[PDB]
Amino acid sequence: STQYETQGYTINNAGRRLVVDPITRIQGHMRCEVNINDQNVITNAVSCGTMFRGLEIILQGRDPRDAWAFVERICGVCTGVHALASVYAIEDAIGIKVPDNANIIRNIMLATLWCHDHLVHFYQLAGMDWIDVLDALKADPRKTSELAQSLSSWPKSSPGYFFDVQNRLKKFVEGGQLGIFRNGYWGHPQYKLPPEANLMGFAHYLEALDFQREIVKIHAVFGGKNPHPNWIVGGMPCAINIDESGAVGAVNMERLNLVQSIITRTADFINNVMIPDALAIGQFNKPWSEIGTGLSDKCVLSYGAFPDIANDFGEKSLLMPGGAVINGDFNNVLPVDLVDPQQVQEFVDHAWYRYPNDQVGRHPFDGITDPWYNPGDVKGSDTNIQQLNEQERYSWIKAPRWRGNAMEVGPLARTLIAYHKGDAATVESVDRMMSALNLPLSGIQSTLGRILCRAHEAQWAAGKLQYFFDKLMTNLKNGNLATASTEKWEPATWPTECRGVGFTEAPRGALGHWAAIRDGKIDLYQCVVPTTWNASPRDPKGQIGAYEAALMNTKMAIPEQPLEILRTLHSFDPCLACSTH
Amino acid sequence: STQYETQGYTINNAGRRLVVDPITRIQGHMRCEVNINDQNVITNAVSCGTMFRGLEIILQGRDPRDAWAFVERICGVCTGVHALASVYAIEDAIGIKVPDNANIIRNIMLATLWCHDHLVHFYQLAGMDWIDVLDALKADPRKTSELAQSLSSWPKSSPGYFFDVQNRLKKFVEGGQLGIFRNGYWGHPQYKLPPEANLMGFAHYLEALDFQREIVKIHAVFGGKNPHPNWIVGGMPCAINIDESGAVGAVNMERLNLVQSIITRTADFINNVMIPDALAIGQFNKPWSEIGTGLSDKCVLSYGAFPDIANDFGEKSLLMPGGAVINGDFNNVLPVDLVDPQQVQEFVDHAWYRYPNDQVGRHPFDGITDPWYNPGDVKGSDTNIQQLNEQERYSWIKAPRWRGNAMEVGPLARTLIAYHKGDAATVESVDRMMSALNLPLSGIQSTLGRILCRAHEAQWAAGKLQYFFDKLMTNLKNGNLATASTEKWEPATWPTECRGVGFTEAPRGALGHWAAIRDGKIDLYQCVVPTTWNASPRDPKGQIGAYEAALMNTKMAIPEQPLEILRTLHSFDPCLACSTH
Amino acid sequence: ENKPRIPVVWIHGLECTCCTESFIRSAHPLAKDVILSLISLDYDDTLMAAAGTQAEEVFEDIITQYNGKYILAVEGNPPLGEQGMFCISSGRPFIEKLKRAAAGASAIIAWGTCASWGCVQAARPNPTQATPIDKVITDKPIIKVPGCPPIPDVMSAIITYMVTFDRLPDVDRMGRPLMFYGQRIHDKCYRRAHFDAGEFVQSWDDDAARKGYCLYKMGCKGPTTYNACSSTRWNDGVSFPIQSGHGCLGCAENGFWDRGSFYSRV
Amino acid sequence: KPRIPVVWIHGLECTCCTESFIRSAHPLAKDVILSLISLDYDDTLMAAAGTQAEEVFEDIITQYNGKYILAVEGNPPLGEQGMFCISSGRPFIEKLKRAAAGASAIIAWGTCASWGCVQAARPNPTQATPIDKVITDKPIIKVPGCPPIPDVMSAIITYMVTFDRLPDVDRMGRPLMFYGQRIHDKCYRRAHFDAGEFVQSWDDDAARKGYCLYKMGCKGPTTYNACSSTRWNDGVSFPIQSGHGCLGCAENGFWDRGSFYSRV
Ligand code: SF4
Ligand code: SF4
Ligand code: SF3
Ligand code: SF3
Ligand code: F3S
Ligand code: F3S
Ligand SMILES: [Cl-]
Ligand SMILES: [Cl-]
Ligand SMILES: [Li+]
Ligand SMILES: [Li+]
Ligand SMILES: [Mg+2]
Ligand SMILES: [Mg+2]
């Protein structure tokens, strides 16, 4: 065994080794290993992406106009975000400006995805880490009603409703076909909710499973379908016609009325179901405000998103702020430049790839994706891994760094950047949440904080949906209908050689696509995706990424039942297909 | 001025004359006049249909295959029922038998209509007679929640929900544009609900307004659209294909899944919102179990409906029983025959029509629709009716009688007929309902009873939707897909001269279409519609119809504010376009 | 700030109420939201609490106070026969109520084929001499929204357009909104592939019918009918006549009832 | 009344097929899971992880050997000894073969499981391979599209449960009900196609009237699916209705059949 120090941690692989493979209630394939000491505390953590497809290789030689459709298939959970980044990147390369309504509609697509993806995460992915579903069978339906009504104005709270939900669950389990609940962690001492809170939460899980399907109707109107809506370089394909012949063939008043109905319902559900449930999890699990901090008190990154001035990706335009903090220096938020070769770089010394020099990082315009499965001296076999060797290569995920620093990305990162830049809405939301919990600001820098920030962002994005819809309507009232710029549609109009960057904030964090075009075709297409950051393996200095750091120093009650590991990992909403692409 | 006795009533047109014109919260156009004595009790009541279109005239010379589409436009509220009666009539004339699935689908169409029409009546048409909308502003939202939860398992019962509803109404009223509530009867002494029940009921009015739109999606699947779905002579046009190429062009598994989802939701709403509200209206308005009896303790009529054996309209097939009771003789339900010229007849001595002899009745196969607007002295002019002359012609509605008896039709009539025929489901539903209210069975024969029976029937019909859907699925599982018979589609296959009757139970009561075909065309098409019975004017013996009888002997608290008249008329769900056609 | 909504007066002539019923089917905005938040529905015999003299008082108060400022919605039509007394409101011909309401209106919406053209009561031999609104009211803007009834979400889209944009929809030569009536059913029908291939239903429930073939030979009037049914569809997009296997009747077009049998080819 | 056991496994995939499934409008996915099937293994939804999830997998495929439906999302890579997709430390293809051996029938959800989809597009770095090239001794129902339509997925499930049989299929294993006709055989813009009325550039006057997307690269003429009839997301739209041509996403090899914007 060995021990070394990095980023304030002592990484020590002595002691019992625990493996969690497969990690469930994430997207894609992940393996996690940890070592624990005599106190059942994690002293080493190992994040491994266990899949690869090679989109960066597949995109070579494609028409830049087609790229969005390929890269959208990086992920069907964060569906649309890679298409947005791609159209942005190609437009940046060629020098295309889209019309205002196209930008507004793209912002609507993004905000819709934030609402959907964050809602479903909270219930379907992370919820069962916090709610003991089987314990709901012990609840008193009238006390459940009283609890719910004390927390929210949401209408669906009758004792009879909770009895009905409880009976549905009782019937579901009474034949012994427990389905997704089979061999769960139910009864683990870290489940702290009373039975009535478990039944309320489970009712809400079911309501969210039903309701989430509605949110994406916005994507269907503007983008044709969800998952995997359509886009174009130059704007959007959803031509508008409000008051002329043939409006039946376009986005018309009836289509926009549908969108407005979805927005209102989405805000209502988030504000009155998800938000009070998130605060309630906080109230009953306050110790988790001090667990899973990881890098979130050291190094956090946002590129920023939601340009409100069309084609302007600067600070005055982006409604979701960008910036970086390193070394805990939150009083000095730093600007990010995605073209600067000294800022974003990826390392592969601990990943299954070849570089000419694996001791250095490569900016994505110099990126190389040359897969090389070489796990080295594993316990077991290279086709039946008992233990990865974290001193050698151990993942399909590259290791991104910002100026050489390991960063956390995602809702907590964004919230911290925006807070410290003085964004009034963020400051107010954070301050109110932490005051409600009687917790210091620092309590957000935690596993619990990641969940609270995600809920805050779902509410933020639902508000932004209305703002964007209103801006679209204002344009239509002023006779501004355009949705596509086509002057540069034809390849003869492009520079013979050009390159560009498309960036945004996906639900899980900072996303960039770097594209080089030559002779009408993609010469290079490199993606650095939020879970690539968070699930990163180590670098040549031994620095650990966000997941490994967040797992460090965590107590486990029952080593064989890894609920604490699941809680922390799920709090980041891991997307492993995203991370590896 | 004059007095006479009929049917146990003393019809006396002395005293103050009150006019209510227009009658609102009905379909179509009606005028009602009454006389009241010095105790403000109605001693004379006059029912006048104030519209006519002449469908029986328009149908002459049409292709029998087209007839359904024309007569469906008798009414957009009981939409579909006239199409059903029409295809039944034409099939009866020609000698056409439809396939089982067509019959099952037609029964689904009818049950859908019952659920929709009854639900909307309860809330949108009659509800404001019972619920004081302004008084809802005084309610305590917590007490409202407690009330609602004591009555039902319905989920939507939180104090915050009731507060939100109340607050929206409060701000609507503060704005000063009272809309549909302006100049209403709010504060009348006959409003007996406490504030919390008014708020509960108003919330449910709005939930029903929203939900009713969903019910008719079943009509859209099988019939293309609602209002006014499509039908064919020979079955239905909605060809089925479950497992073959091209199922995308037909009623397929996805379409049937949609139908099933609507059925479940429909039953849930009716059972958990409408039913408990109807019982709550009963609990707070028990004196109305003794008001508005009219003909319901003397003469009631049903034709029967919902043939379960395809093409069999006999007693063993019809799921909703037919029969007649006269002279209060409920122990002897009498058989009805729609071809017998001595049974159903229409009189016009008090109506705006010409007959060769207006002192006799004509069976519909001898029917005549020769309009003649002749009001006599109405204390104004022909274009200014100040006082209808009920001693002469006073209505566009013909006067139907059964064996010369004046009958009530509709939900209460059907419930009494089924009860007294010994239908177990009806006997149990009715006894349990009257027990819950601690009222004798006789309390059903009243204005309150009409409303209770309507709610019972909505519940019944929602159950029957599932029964019929299951029957359809059973056929499909057995490979029996047929939806149309076309052997006799072509006019060359028809008898040169033939006639037929189509009958059913519309939401409002017994419906018949009598059709004669000659040389490929409609030679005669006579309709007798439920509100024609109930809203009937007098006959040569001076016998009064169901509305006039129900209004007789009613106390009015405030003659100028005719809430009691509205309550009783609305309890029959008047459809004036139906009545006059 | 409690802010007023545009006054709307909805009157009914000879009609079946299909157009009111269609309105309340609206999926987006819900009719509830239209009434509570978008317009002020100030008179409507189908829904209002007041009856008789109380309803007459509402009608008089609104058209007086809001003279020149309310939208008049008309469902149904006036009959000219029997001195107008085939449709009687407050003891007098409906046409008198129509004219009074029209005189104070800023604009008129003629809902449905009844108000637009005549519909079923005007079909041969038109016993009541039912007459469309634009032949009686000749000095007001009239937007025709035909169909029997028009599509629910077309009705609500037209209302929302008028409120949101504060203007009348642009119209064709017959006064129909271009947005929903500019193209034919058959110009947007998903069975056009079959039409163009000569793939037709020939009798009900034949193999062609079970594959969704074209309904031309079963009498479909889609080729001559302007409406949105094949694109917007009905009842929250669930279906339309042709999708459920019956040819278009032509119900949005003037005189459709008398343009031959529904089962005779265009 | 026990519900039919279903084991849902994931190879290389983006999860669009799982996500599509949960969009189902009728029956709701909730109701499928609670009342129609027993969803006994699913990495995206299940509570258990790691050794607990492995225990569930082993128990279910043993107890219900010969009786469970296997749903497959994604595909196996043959490159690097299969270690481009690793589950429980071993190549995913081993899990696929074990699950397949006990299945009564297999549903290949989506273009990934059916044909290969994006990872199998040129130059197919991982040697991603559709499941019918690996599993050759079991009934496989292909339900292609990227992803398939939500209510098509749930209709196929309901058909199988209600009728207690597999849907009838074409010669490629696709359910005739939803894949028997082409997009262009039921497209509401066919009137324009027939008339030679085409969008020529995005947002041109033709585009604003809903003209045909053939000249913009629509692949509807060569693509079998239900999008133009059933539509997407509770019938709200489909690609062409919202102004983009069909990509061809239900067809084998559609990524490599030229640019999306090249005419068919
Ligand atoms: S079904 Fe009617 S509207 Fe559709 S293509 Fe055929 S004829 Fe035209
Ligand atoms: S848009 Fe595509 S599928 Fe539709 S008619 Fe044109 S080419 Fe065919
Ligand atoms: Fe629509 S009220 Fe019904 S009949 Fe044809 S529109 Fe009229
Ligand atoms: Fe549908 S997992 Fe998403 S990539 Fe194309 S189907 Fe695969
Ligand atoms: S009958 Fe009418 S509803 Fe539409 S499809 Fe034809 S215009
Ligand atoms: S791209 Fe796919 S979703 Fe349908 S319209 Fe074409 S098959
Ligand atoms: Cl007409
Ligand atoms: Cl493929
Ligand atoms: Li018969
Ligand atoms: Li008054
Ligand atoms: Mg990359
Ligand atoms: Mg008659």
From Swiss-Prot, chains A, B:
Give the way it sits in the membrane: Peripheral membrane protein
On cofactor binding, the record's note says: Binds 1 nickel ion per subunit.
Q: Does the keyword Secreted apply?
A: no
Q: Which GO terms describe its molecular function?
A: electron transfer activity; ferredoxin hydrogenase activity; hydrogenase (acceptor) activity; nickel cation binding
Q: Which cofactor does it need?
A: Ni(2+)
InterPro entries per the UniProt record, alphabetical: Ni-dep_hyd_lsu, Ni-dep_hyd_lsu_Ni_BS, NiFe-Hase_large, NiFe/NiFeSe_hydrgnase_LSU
SUPFAM superfamilies hit by this protein: HydB/Nqo4-like (SSF56762)
EC number(s) for this protein? 1.12.99.6
Q: Name one GO cellular component term.
A: [Ni-Fe] hydrogenase complex
- Residues binding Ni(2+), per UniProt: C75, C78, C575, C578
Return one Gene Ontology term, BP aspect. Answer: cellular response to starvation
Catalytic activity as recorded in UniProt: H2 + A = AH2
Q: Where in the cell is it found?
A: Cell membrane
The reply to whether rRNA-binding figures as a keyword in the UniProt entry is no
| Pfam families per the UniProt record, alphabetical | NiFeSe_Hases
Keywords of the record, alphabetical order, are: Cell membrane, Membrane, Metal-binding, Nickel, Oxidoreductase
Similarity-based family? Belongs to the [NiFe]/[NiFeSe] hydrogenase large subunit family.
Please describe the quaternary structure of this protein.
Heterodimer of a large and a small subunit.
What is the stated purpose of this protein? This is one of three E.coli hydrogenases synthesized in response to different physiological conditions. HYD1 is believed to have a role in hydrogen cycling during fermentative growth.
Q: Which NCBIfam families match?
A: PRK10170.1
Q: What is this protein called?
A: Hydrogenase-1 large chain
The UniProt gene name for this protein comes to: hyaB
From Swiss-Prot, chain C:
PTM summary from the entry reads:
Exported by the Tat system. The position of the signal peptide cleavage has been experimentally proven.
Q: What kind of membrane protein is this, topologically?
A: Single-pass type I membrane protein
Documented EC number(s): 1.12.99.6
Task: Please name the GO terms of the biological process aspect recorded for this protein, alphabetically.
Answer: anaerobic electron transport chain; anaerobic respiration; cellular response to starvation; fermentation; hydrogen metabolic process
Q: What is the protein's major site of localization?
A: membrane
- Residues given in the record as [4Fe-4S] cluster 2 binding sites: H186, C189, C214, C220
Keywords from the named record: 3Fe-4S, 4Fe-4S, Cell inner membrane, Cell membrane, Iron, Iron-sulfur, Membrane, Metal-binding, Oxidoreductase, Signal, Transmembrane, Transmembrane helix
A single MF term (Gene Ontology): hydrogenase (acceptor) activity
Q: Which GO terms describe its cellular component?
A: [Ni-Fe] hydrogenase complex; ferredoxin hydrogenase complex; membrane; periplasmic side of plasma membrane
Tell me which cofactor or cofactors this protein depends on: [4Fe-4S] cluster; [3Fe-4S] cluster
Q: Where in the cell is it found?
A: Cell inner membrane
List positions binding [4Fe-4S] cluster 1: C16, C19, C114, C148
Cofactor note from UniProt?
Binds 2 [4Fe-4S] clusters. Binds 1 [3Fe-4S] cluster.
For side Periplasmic, which residue ranges? Answer: 1-266
Give the first-level EC class, as a single word.
Answer: oxidoreductase
| Catalysed reaction equations from the record | H2 + A = AH2
Q: Which residues bind [3Fe-4S] cluster?
A: C229, C248, C251
What's the family?
A: Belongs to the [NiFe]/[NiFeSe] hydrogenase small subunit family.
Provide the assembly information. Heterodimer of a large and a small subunit.
* Role summary: This is one of three E.coli hydrogenases synthesized in response to different physiological conditions. HYD1 is believed to have a role in hydrogen cycling during fermentative growth.
Q: What is this protein called?
A: Hydrogenase-1 small chain
Species of origin = Escherichia coli (strain K12)
Which residues of the complete protein does this chain represent? 47 to 312 of 372
Swiss-Prot record, chain D:
Alphabetical keyword list:
3Fe-4S, 4Fe-4S, Cell inner membrane, Cell membrane, Iron, Iron-sulfur, Membrane, Metal-binding, Oxidoreductase, Signal, Transmembrane, Transmembrane helix
What's the encoding gene here?
Answer: hyaA
Q: Which family does it belong to?
A: Belongs to the [NiFe]/[NiFeSe] hydrogenase small subunit family.
* Enzyme Commission number(s) from the entry: 1.12.99.6
The catalysed reaction is:
H2 + A = AH2
An example Gene Ontology cellular component term from the record? [Ni-Fe] hydrogenase complex
Q: Which residues bind [4Fe-4S] cluster 1?
A: C14, C17, C112, C146
Please name the GO terms that the record assigns under molecular function: 3 iron, 4 sulfur cluster binding; 4 iron, 4 sulfur cluster binding; electron transfer activity; ferredoxin hydrogenase activity; hydrogenase (acceptor) activity; metal ion binding
- Please report the record's description of how this protein sits within the membrane: Single-pass type I membrane protein
Quote the function comment for this protein. This is one of three E.coli hydrogenases synthesized in response to different physiological conditions. HYD1 is believed to have a role in hydrogen cycling during fermentative growth.
Q: What is its main location?
A: membrane
Q: What is this protein called?
A: Hydrogenase-1 small chain
Bound how, and how many: what does the cofactor note say?
Binds 2 [4Fe-4S] clusters.
